[PDB]
Amino acid sequence: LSSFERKKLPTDFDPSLYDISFQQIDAEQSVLNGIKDENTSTVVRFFGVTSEGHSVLCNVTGFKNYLYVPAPNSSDANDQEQINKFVHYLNETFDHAIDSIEVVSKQSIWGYSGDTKLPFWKIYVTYPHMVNKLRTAFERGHLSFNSWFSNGTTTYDNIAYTLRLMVDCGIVGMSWITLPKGKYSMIEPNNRVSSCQLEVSINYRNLIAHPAEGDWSHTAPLRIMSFSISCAGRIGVFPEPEYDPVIQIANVVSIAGAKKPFIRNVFTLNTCSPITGSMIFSHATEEEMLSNWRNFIIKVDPDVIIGYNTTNFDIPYLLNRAKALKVNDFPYFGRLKTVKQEIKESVFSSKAYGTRETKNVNIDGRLQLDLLQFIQREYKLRSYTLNAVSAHFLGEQKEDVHYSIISDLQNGDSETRRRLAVYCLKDAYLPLRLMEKLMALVNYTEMARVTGVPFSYLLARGQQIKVVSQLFRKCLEIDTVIPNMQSQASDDQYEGATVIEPIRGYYDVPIATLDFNSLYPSIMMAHNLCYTTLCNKATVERLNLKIDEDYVITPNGDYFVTTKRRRGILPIILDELISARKRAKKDLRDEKDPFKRDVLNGRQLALKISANSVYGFTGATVGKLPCLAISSSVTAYGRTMILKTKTAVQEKYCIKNGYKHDAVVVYGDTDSVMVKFGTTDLKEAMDLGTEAAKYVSTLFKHPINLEFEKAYFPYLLINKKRYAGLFWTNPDKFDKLDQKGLASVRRDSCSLVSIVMNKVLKKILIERNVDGALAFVRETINDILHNRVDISKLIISKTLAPNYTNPQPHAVLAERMKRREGVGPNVGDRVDYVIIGGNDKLYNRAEDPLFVLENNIQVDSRYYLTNQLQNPIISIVAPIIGDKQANGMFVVKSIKINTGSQKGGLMSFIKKVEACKSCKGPLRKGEGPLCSNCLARSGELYIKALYDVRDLEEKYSRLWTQCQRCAGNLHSEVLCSNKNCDIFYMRVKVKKELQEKVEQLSKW
């Protein structure tokens, strides 16, 4: 519509006289045509965009998936005619798939056995899918030519064809490529299959693949398209694609690095009133809307389709709805004009990521950056709803329209549909703001450029594929082949680290903190630890290597060789990763905005996970190339290093050498040692910690380096891997209040515990007044016992698991929700609940907070007092006031049994005899709120009731007026379903409580 299509390249164009330099985004292998280049037909399409905005479909042609096998050590194997007869037999076996066989000189990645290279047969195939068969035969024994490979030789260099091409040519994902002058060609308009402005093809040996450093580090003007849908379903049921139509589709298409999107459209099902600042396309039937949205996607040519819960709800619902409406022309909204976009259900499983079930869609040529998955992977939040996330990062608890009323807003006037459209537009613009604040695209681009994987791998693949790609690249650059070691079944665990005993107590003395700079990567790159340096006793005896100069032995007992024999490739990969992390931390150093500070911290934190993921992959039994020797060696080195630094810092800083006190290693967490020098001064403690870290780094190998990071003036060591204190990096002002492992920074504890622990630690460490902290704890206990705590602060969230042997509360809750509502949280979702009161097991006492808010069922206050708040508060206040004095304040001296508006099986048809006040005398036959015995207090109880009513009515007015201000509307009703707003769960509670207190005041 004169504003959607990209800029058309100059019409004075030709396959010559122009160099199409473009930054690829997507890579996909597919057959090209009946023609064959380099004796093969399959190609790798590189969907990208140039520096101006012209979408390119560079076809890389003429690459055959080669397979490395050990050349047979037979006399008749170096013969040319024998190789010819063997390749003829191979062709006759699978009907002419193999192309040729190149005898190369290459060495294995496994172990060092001299600088000699073995003869390796590099077998080509016309189409790559043959290798998976061919390789398999070489490991089963289904090939017998002169009984060469009948026993089964271990194959080598097993990877997919796309990554194979990218590794051979050097095309790291999201990098810059360039087609030289005229060497490429352009596909005829009667054979172009994509909707791109270009459709070219070039043999792989001609193009130049630029690195992502220097002149070729910039990005391309990507057309990011954020979108959302809104569907009006039947009453009391979840939206299903068979009966509940899509009523609105909002699209907020923008550009990478742009401060504002260039279009805001709302494809509506009926006539929609105009919305200032956005376009509106109002249709008549749903088929027309779907077809026009498809044509709109095709027209705009978006490089990325970002959104929230798009891969799981939006796009699958749209596809299934188009299928149900017999719109057979909808699912072709990819960069290819003939292939379908279909839903394939995959399952991801990882220890650090949890089991998830994703419904992926094959949207070709366009990246996908579903913000839900990106935030589940990068950040650890209590809830992962759009409202909770928008309140966490952006910080706005805006209104979320009720779901049941949607069916009555679409069936109304045009202004009802207009406000529906503005809701949809806000929902569709939220993911753009999220991606711009979190810097998702920049971080993931840096990641895909350092590791060298396709962008799409960062969301559907773990940390193994990155180290795999890095290893393959470094191997290709060093003439080495990676064997296809069959992954072992499993293992229980190997020996990790040796966490030092945590001397508990309260430490007002400044505790310095000295930790290692990337301990495990430093250990790896410091001792020449890799796959290619792993010798054994037989090897060193056969080669006659000198000890401590040519080869070394690790504390685990394994053998390696010094850098004088062979430089590993894991050291090089780790050098690359730490040089990336150095600049990622320098950028954080040169940055002021606290939100951008946290973003750069997350960026740095993801570059030290991969540097640790190298060691994790070397130790990962489940996965290719599991070399437990190297992981065990680095763990042994780390243990011995922390023990040695503990000994050294306890030895040098003592009385004899001329120091004031005796330095004591208070705590150690496998890389850090929190030495206590004794000096109550803080600046002196910082200087001594710096000097100690420097002296310790003096006693280690070059890549290793200990650094003074922080100091804890008030230090509260609760237990092992659990403590808190004040962060003092400067002797003039504390930075923050740390809480490691405590129940506050956890997620399976109600937010009330977090708030209480934060306030208590603030009063104890910052202000140093334990009396006020104890008074606040007593007030909190009284609030809990008297039902004075909001439901929103009593919500516990737990991550659901696929299978459960021992029943859990959230699992049974999800099952009951599925049986009752109609749909429940699948695996991987954080189910939230509150613990209602009852008699049966705890897993049978858990309910949806909305069900509790609706049914007014009481909350188990004693459970939250004793099981949720008692233990953490006790553990944090006992090192100050003793155990018994701390536990005494948790006795239940007061209770409030609600028994109100709970009409059910028995709580209905029951009376309230309305006993007397302030004495509860049942002899209240005489009317009035007081009995004749205690009538002298008739002037105080009325004061109490009236002031309770005053506070309640003030709070009620504030809350409801605030709700109206938030809803933007004053003359309309605010039916808001947003349960992530602190005022939610509270307005209704205050309304009920004020109703009861007013009815109690009406007795006088």
Partner DNA sequence: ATGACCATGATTACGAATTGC
Partner DNA sequence: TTAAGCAATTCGTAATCATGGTCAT
61 HSE (CA, 13 A, CB side): 24
Does residue 399 belong to the site contacting ligand D3T (CB under 6 A)?
A: no
The 3-state secondary structure of 28-81, one letter per residue: EEEECCCCCCCCCCEEEEEEEEECCCCEEEEEEECCCCCEEEECCCCHHHCCHH
Shortest Å distance, C-beta 982 to ligand SF4: 8
601 binds DNA (CB under 7 A): no
| Contact set for ligand D3T, span 697-716 (CB under 6 A) | none
State the binding partner of 517 from DNA, ligand D3T, Zn ion, none, CB within 5 to 8 A by kind.
ligand D3T
**From ligand SF4, Mg ion, ligand D3T, none, interface partner of 993 (C-beta below 5 to 8 A by class):** none
For position 929 contacting Zn ion by CB under 5 A, the verdict is no
Q: Is the Cβ of residue 602 or residue 921 nearer to Zn ion in the bound state?
A: 921
Contacts of 423 (CB under 8 A, 6+ apart): 230, 401
Should residue 517 be labelled a site residue for ligand D3T when binding is judged by CB under 6 A?
yes
671 is a contact residue toward ligand D3T (CB under 6 A): yes
Can you name the residues that pair with 804 across neighbouring β-strands? none
Q: Is 769 in the site for DNA (CB under 7 A)?
A: no
Q: Which stretch binds ligand D3T (CB under 6 A): 87-95, 300-308, 514-522, 935-943?
A: 514-522
Is 526 among the residues that bind ligand D3T (CB under 6 A)? Answer: no
Q: State the binding partner of 612 from DNA, Mg ion, ligand SF4, none, CB within 5 to 8 A by kind.
A: DNA
Beta strands per DSSP E along 576-705: 664-668, 673-676
Of residues 79, 491, 821, 914, which one binds DNA by CB under 7 A? Answer: 491
Q: Which of 164, 426, 449, 608 binds ligand D3T (CB under 6 A)?
A: 608
- What is the C-alpha to C-alpha distance for residues 25 and 257, in angstroms, rounded to an integer? 16
Q: What does 974 bind: ligand SF4, DNA, Zn ion, none (CB cut-off 5 to 8 Å by kind)?
A: ligand SF4
Closer to ligand SF4 by Cβ: residue 582 or 958:
958
Least distance from Zn ion to the Cβ atom of residue 932, Å? 8
Distance of CA 464 to CAs 165, 453, 471, 623, 702, Å?
A: 19, 11, 11, 8, 28
Q: Which of these, 667, 664, 666, lies nearest to 653 by C-alpha position?
A: 664
532 binds Mg ion (CB under 5 A): no
Q: How far is the CB of 611 from ligand D3T (least distance, A)?
A: 7
Considering only CA atoms, give the Rg of the chain. 34
Q: Shortest gap between Cβ of 803 and DNA (angstroms)?
A: 7
Q: Is there binding between residue 244 and DNA (CB under 7 A)? A: no
| 941 is an interface residue for Zn ion by CB under 5 A | no
- Give the footprint of ligand D3T on residues 894-953 (CB under 6 A): none
Ranges within 653-672 binding Mg ion (CB under 5 A)? 669, 671-672
Among residue numbers 867 through 926, which ones bind Zn ion (CB under 5 A)?
A: 916, 919, 921
- Please identify, among the stretches 62-70, 222-230, 303-311, 613-621, the one whose residues bind DNA according to the rule CB under 7 A: 613-621
The DSSP bridge partners found for residue 360 are 344
Give whichever of 111 and 462 is closer to DNA, judged by the CB atom.
Answer: 462
At 465, list the tokens.
């594929």
Q: By CB under 7 A, what part of segment 627-666 binds DNA?
A: 631
Question: Rule CB under 7 A: is residue 842 a binding residue for DNA?
Answer: yes
> Which of residues 457, 516, 653, 956 is near ligand D3T by CB under 6 A?
516
Please report, as residue ranges, which positions from 67 to 86 form the binding site for DNA (by CB under 7 A): none
Partner whose footprint covers residue 397, from ligand D3T, ligand SF4, Mg ion, none (CB < 5 to 8 Å by kind): ligand SF4
Residue nearer to DNA on the CB measure, 615 or 715: 615
| Residue whose CB is less far from ligand D3T, 614 or 753 | 614
Nearer to ligand SF4, 523 or 990 (CB): 990
Token match 């207190």: residue? 997
- Nearest Cα neighbor of 177 from 28, 303, 27, 305 is 27
Q: Are strands 480-481 and 367-370 parallel, antiparallel or unpaired?
A: unpaired
Measuring CA to CA, which residue among 510, 868, 474 is closest to residue 687?
A: 510
Token pair for residue 599? 């973003």
468 exposure class (CB count in 10 Å sphere: 0-12, 13-18, 19+): buried
Closest approach of Mg ion to the CB of residue 336, in Å? 47
- In the complex, the smallest distance separating the C-beta of residue 605 from Mg ion, rounded to whole angstroms, is 12
Q: Choose, by CB under 6 A, the member of 59, 518, 780, 875 that binds ligand D3T.
A: 518
List the structure tokens of 581. 């992390």
| Residue 869: exposure state from Cβ atoms within 10 A (0-12, 13-18, ≥19) | buried
Nearest C-alpha neighbor of 738 from the set 756, 719, 720, 711 = 711
Rounded Cα distance, 38 and 60, in Å: 11
Checking 949-952 for CB contacts under 8 A at 24+ apart, the result is: 949/994, 949/997, 949/998, 949/1001, 952/990, 952/993, 952/994, 952/997, 952/998
Should residue 202 be labelled a site residue for Zn ion when binding is judged by CB under 5 A?
A: no
Give the residue closest to ligand SF4 by C-beta: 981
Give the amino acid at 706.
L
Query: What is the identity of the amino acid at 658?
Result: G
Using the rule CB under 5 A, is 825 a contact of Zn ion?
no
Residue whose token pair is 């299934």: 320
| 612 binds ligand D3T per the rule CB under 6 A | yes
Residue whose CB is less far from DNA, 246 or 812: 812
User: Is there binding between residue 22 and ligand D3T (CB under 6 A)?
Assistant: no
581 binds DNA (CB under 7 A): no
The 3-class secondary structure across 350-374, one letter per residue, is CCCCCCEEEEEECCCCCEEEEHHHH
Of 801 and 941, nearer to Zn ion (C-beta) is: 941
Work out what residue 209 binds among ligand SF4, Mg ion, DNA, none; the CB cut-off runs from 5 to 8 Å by kind.
none
CA dihedral 93, 62, 177, 131 (to 10 degrees): 0
3 state SS of 792: helix
* Nearest Cα to Cα of residue 995 among 952, 961, 960, 963: 952
Q: Which residues bind Mg ion (CB under 5 A)?
A: 515, 669, 671-672
Q: Which residues bind ligand D3T (CB under 6 A)?
A: 515-520, 608-609, 612, 616, 671
